[PDB]
Design an enzyme around this catalytic site. Structure first.
Site, mmCIF file in Angstrom:
data_model
loop_
_atom_site.group_PDB
_atom_site.id
_atom_site.type_symbol
_atom_site.label_atom_id
_atom_site.label_comp_id
_atom_site.label_asym_id
_atom_site.label_seq_id
_atom_site.Cartn_x
_atom_site.Cartn_y
_atom_site.Cartn_z
ATOM 1 N N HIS A 64 0.831 -1.196 0.000
ATOM 2 C CA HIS A 64 0.000 0.000 0.000
ATOM 3 C C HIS A 64 0.871 1.253 0.000
ATOM 4 C CE1 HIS A 64 -3.512 -2.451 1.718
ATOM 5 N NE2 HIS A 64 -3.741 -2.225 0.413
ATOM 6 N N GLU A 67 1.901 3.707 3.007
ATOM 7 C CA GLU A 67 2.405 3.116 4.241
ATOM 8 C C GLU A 67 3.925 3.102 4.239
ATOM 9 O OE1 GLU A 67 -1.540 0.261 4.278
ATOM 10 O OE2 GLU A 67 0.420 -0.699 4.514
ATOM 11 N N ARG A 122 -3.315 4.853 -2.001
ATOM 12 C CA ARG A 122 -3.264 3.511 -1.419
ATOM 13 C C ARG A 122 -3.098 2.435 -2.487
ATOM 14 N NH1 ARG A 122 -5.546 0.184 2.653
ATOM 15 N NH2 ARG A 122 -6.725 -1.634 1.898
ATOM 16 N N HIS A 192 2.670 -3.972 6.628
ATOM 17 C CA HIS A 192 1.770 -2.835 6.426
ATOM 18 C C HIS A 192 1.920 -1.863 7.600
ATOM 19 C CE1 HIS A 192 -1.095 -4.373 3.264
ATOM 20 N NE2 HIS A 192 -0.343 -5.464 3.491
ATOM 21 N N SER A 193 1.225 -0.730 7.516
ATOM 22 C CA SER A 193 0.978 0.126 8.678
ATOM 23 C C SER A 193 -0.393 0.769 8.459
ATOM 24 C CB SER A 193 2.069 1.203 8.790
ATOM 25 O OG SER A 193 1.917 2.208 7.801
ATOM 26 N N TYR A 194 -1.013 1.322 9.502
ATOM 27 C CA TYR A 194 -0.512 1.316 10.873
ATOM 28 C C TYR A 194 -1.524 0.564 11.741
ATOM 29 C CZ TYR A 194 -4.138 4.849 11.087
ATOM 30 O OH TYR A 194 -5.343 5.508 10.993
ATOM 31 N N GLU A 266 1.248 -4.936 11.174
ATOM 32 C CA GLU A 266 0.849 -3.533 11.115
ATOM 33 C C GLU A 266 1.766 -2.756 12.049
ATOM 34 O OE1 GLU A 266 -1.228 -2.129 9.235
ATOM 35 O OE2 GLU A 266 -2.415 -3.783 8.412
HETATM 36 C C1 LIG Z 1 -4.538 1.322 8.942
HETATM 37 C C2 LIG Z 1 -4.320 -0.088 8.380
HETATM 38 C C3 LIG Z 1 -5.152 -1.099 9.150
HETATM 39 C C4 LIG Z 1 -4.599 -0.118 6.863
HETATM 40 N N1 LIG Z 1 -6.023 0.050 6.563
HETATM 41 C C5 LIG Z 1 -6.490 0.965 5.713
HETATM 42 O O1 LIG Z 1 -5.774 1.831 5.174
HETATM 43 O O2 LIG Z 1 -7.841 0.947 5.533
HETATM 44 C C6 LIG Z 1 -8.377 1.853 4.545
HETATM 45 C C7 LIG Z 1 -9.707 1.683 4.152
HETATM 46 C C8 LIG Z 1 -10.374 2.705 3.432
HETATM 47 C C9 LIG Z 1 -11.731 2.536 3.056
HETATM 48 C C10 LIG Z 1 -12.423 1.346 3.400
HETATM 49 C C11 LIG Z 1 -11.758 0.321 4.119
HETATM 50 C C12 LIG Z 1 -10.402 0.487 4.492
HETATM 51 P P1 LIG Z 1 -4.021 -1.641 6.015
HETATM 52 O O3 LIG Z 1 -2.639 -1.952 6.426
HETATM 53 O O4 LIG Z 1 -4.307 -1.382 4.584
HETATM 54 O O5 LIG Z 1 -4.991 -2.860 6.476
HETATM 55 C C13 LIG Z 1 -4.977 -4.064 5.664
HETATM 56 C C14 LIG Z 1 -5.811 -3.892 4.384
HETATM 57 O O6 LIG Z 1 -6.849 -3.201 4.466
HETATM 58 O O7 LIG Z 1 -5.389 -4.468 3.363
HETATM 59 C C15 LIG Z 1 -5.515 -5.283 6.414
HETATM 60 C C16 LIG Z 1 -6.712 -5.197 7.167
HETATM 61 C C17 LIG Z 1 -7.288 -6.368 7.710
HETATM 62 C C18 LIG Z 1 -6.666 -7.624 7.512
HETATM 63 C C19 LIG Z 1 -5.462 -7.706 6.767
HETATM 64 C C20 LIG Z 1 -4.791 -9.057 6.545
HETATM 65 N N2 LIG Z 1 -5.411 -9.733 5.396
HETATM 66 C C21 LIG Z 1 -4.887 -6.536 6.220
HETATM 67 ZN ZN LIG Z 2 -1.927 -1.713 4.126
#
Ligand SMILES: CC(C)[C@H](NC(=O)OCc1ccccc1)P(=O)(O)O[C@H](C(=O)O)c1cccc(CN)c1
Ligand SMILES: [Zn+2]
Length: 304
Positions: A64, A67, A122, A192-194, A266
Site C-alpha cells: 500500500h 504506508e 493507497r 503494512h501500517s498502521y 501492522e
Molecule cells: C490502517 C491499516 C489497518 C490499513 N487500513 C487501511 O488503510 O484501511 C483503509 C480503508 C479505506 C476505506 C475502506 C476500508 C479500508 P491496512 O494496512 O491497509 O490494512 C490491511 C488492508 O486493508 O489491506 C488489512 C486489514 C485487515 C486484515 C489484513 C490481513 N489480510 C490486512
Molecule cells: Zn496496508
C-alpha cells in the site's frame, strides 16, 4: 542519496537494490520478478548465504503506497542482515540455513504517486475500463474469498478488488513467484501500517485456521519480544476479528497455498501520525520490528 533513516523515493530505492547487492554479492542476489502497470521493475532480493536446496521465508513491503514505514522496514532488514552476518549468532544461523526473499516495494507505481502527487494514495495506478477512476487495492486482489467481504467492486473505491483475482501485474507477479517456490517457502510475512498488530488468517471469513492455537502462541511471543526494546504494545489475532474483514488478502492466500506461517504486520503507530509516521521514528520502529521478525524466523527454522 539513500538513507536508512529517511523515506527514500523509488529512484533511490531502486539504485539502493543495485548498490547493496553489488556490495554484498556473497549475501544478496537481485532479480526482477515482473513489471508494474507503469513499467517499473519489481525487484526481489534473495538474502542469505548461498547454497543448494535451502528453505526460505518470503517477506514483502509496500503493498500500500502511503504506508511508508513498510518500505523503510524492508530496507532496514537487509542492512541488518548484511552487517551482522558472521557476528550475531542468530542472524548468522538464519542466513546459513535459509533464504529470506525480500520484496522491498510491491506497489511501486502507487509509491511513486505518493511522492509526486498524493501522499495518501493507497491503490495501484492501473486504468479501469469505462471509468476515469484509477487503481486496484492489491490486498483485495488475491484469490482468497475474492471480493466476498470488506471489498468493493467499484474501481473508484479504495478497496476495489479488481476486475478479477490477480488482475494486477504486481499481484500476479507475486503470486506467480510464490507458486513457483512453494516447496521452499515456509513462512509468508507481509508488512503494512498502521495499528501495531500481528495478524494471521483468516480475514476473508471468521473461520479459524487449522493451526490457530500455534499461530496465536507464535504471535503472542513475537509481540512480547517486540515490546522488550522500547515498550511498544502490539495486539494480535485473526484478521477478521482483530481489525476488520478484508477478503482477497495475500496472507490468507499464501496460507491456503499451504504456507502454514502467514502473518500481516501492522507497524507504528495507532493513529497519532497514522500513515505519516515521522522519519524520527523509523529507527525505533524498525529495530523493534526486527526482534519480532527474527523471533518468528527462529521459531520457523526450529520447526522444519
Ligand atoms: C490502517 C491499516 C489497518 C490499513 N487500513 C487501511 O488503510 O484501511 C483503509 C480503508 C479505506 C476505506 C475502506 C476500508 C479500508 P491496512 O494496512 O491497509 O490494512 C490491511 C488492508 O486493508 O489491506 C488489512 C486489514 C485487515 C486484515 C489484513 C490481513 N489480510 C490486512
Ligand atoms: Zn496496508
Amino acid at each position: 542519496g539513500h538513507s536508512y533513516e529517511k523515506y527514500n523515493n523509488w529512484e533511490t530505492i531502486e539504485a539502493w537494490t543495485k548498490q547493496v547487492t553489488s556490495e554484498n554479492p556473497d549475501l544478496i542476489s537481485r532479480t526482477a520478478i515482473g513489471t508494474t502497470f507503469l513499467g517499473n521493475n519489481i525487484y526481489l532480493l534473495k538474502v542469505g548465504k548461498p547454497g543448494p536446496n535451502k528453505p526460505a521465508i518470503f517477506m514483502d513491503c509496500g503493498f500500500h503506497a502511503r504506508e511508508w514505514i513498510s518500505h523503510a522496514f524492508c530496507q532496514w532488514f537487509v542492512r541488518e542482515a548484511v552487517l551482522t552476518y558472521g557476528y550475531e549468532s542468530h542472524m548468522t544461523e538464519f542466513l546459513n540455513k535459509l533464504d529470506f526473499y525480500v520484496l522491498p516495494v510491491l506497489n511501486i507505481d502507487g509509491y511513486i504517486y505518493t511522492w509526486t502527487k498524493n501522499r495518501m494514495w493507497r491503490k495501484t495506478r492501473s486504468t479501469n475500463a469505462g471509468t476515469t477512476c484509477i487503481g486496484t487495492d492489491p490486498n483485495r486482489n488475491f484469490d482468497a474469498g475474492w471480493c466476498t467481504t470488506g471489498a468493493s467492486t467499484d474501481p473508484c473505491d479504495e478497496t476495489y478488488c479488481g476486475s478479477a483475482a490477480e488482475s494486477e501485474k504486481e499481484t500476479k507477479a507475486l503470486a506467480d513467484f510464490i507458486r513457483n517456490n512453494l516447496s521452499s517457502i515456509k513462512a509468508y510475512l507481509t508488512i503494512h501500517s498502521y495499528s501495531q498488530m500481528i495478524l494471521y488468517p483468516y480475514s476473508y471469513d471468521y473461520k479459524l485456521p487449522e493451526n490457530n492455537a500455534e499461530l496465536n502462541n507464535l504471535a503472542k511471543a513475537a509481540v512480547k519480544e517486540l515490546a522488550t526494546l522500547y515498550g511498544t504494545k502490539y495486539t494480535y489475532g485473526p484478521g477478521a476479528t482483530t481489525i476488520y474483514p478484508a477478503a482477497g488478502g495475500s496472507d490468507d492466500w499464501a496460507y491456503d497455498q499451504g504456507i502454514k506461517y502467514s502473518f500481516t504486520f501492522e507497524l507504528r503507530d495507532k493513529g497519532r501520525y497514522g500513515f505519516i509516521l515521522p522519519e524520527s521514528q523509523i529507527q525505533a520502529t524498525c529495530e523493534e520490528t526486527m526482534l519480532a521478525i527474527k523471533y518468528v524466523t527462529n521459531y520457523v527454522l526450529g520447526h522444519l
